[PDB]
Amino acid sequence: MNPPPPETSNPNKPKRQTNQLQYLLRVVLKTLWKHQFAWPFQQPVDAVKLNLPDYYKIIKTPMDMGTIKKRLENNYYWNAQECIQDFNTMFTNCYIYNKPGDDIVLMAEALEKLFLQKINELP
Ligand SMILES: Cc1n[nH]c(C)c1-c1ccnc(Nc2ccc3c(c2)N(C(C)C)[C@H](C)C(=O)N3C)n1
In a domain, 8, yes or no: no
Radius of gyration of the chain (CA): 14
- Nearest Cα residue to 94 out of 73, 115, 75: 115
DSSP secondary-structure letter at 99? -
In a domain, 64, yes or no: yes
In a domain, 73, yes or no: yes
From which experimental method does this structure derive? X-ray
- Nearest Cα residue to 87 out of 39, 8, 28: 28
Please give the Cα distance from 60 to 58 (Å, whole number).
Answer: 6
108 Cβ inside 6 Å of ligand 1: no
In ligand 1, the atom with minimum distance to the C-alpha of 93 is 27
| 103 alpha carbon – ligand 1 mean position (Å) | 9
- CA dist 118 to 3, 27, 34, 64, 70, Å? 31, 7, 14, 18, 19
Please give the Cα distance from 89 to 61 (Å, whole number).
Answer: 7
In a domain, 99, yes or no: yes
In a domain, 34, yes or no: yes
Resolution (A): 1.1
In a domain, 88, yes or no: yes
CATH of the domain at 73: 1.20.920.10
In a domain, 37, yes or no: yes
- Residue 27's domain comprises 19-120
In ligand 1, the atom with minimum distance to the C-alpha of 97 is 27
| Sign of the Cα pseudo-torsion (107, 119, 8, 82, in order) | positive
In ligand 1, the atom with minimum distance to the C-alpha of 40 is 15
Count of domains for the chain = 1
In a domain, 7, yes or no: no
Question: In 3-state terms, the chain is what percent helix, strand and coil (to 5)?
Answer: 55, 0, 45
55 Cβ inside 6 Å of ligand 1: yes
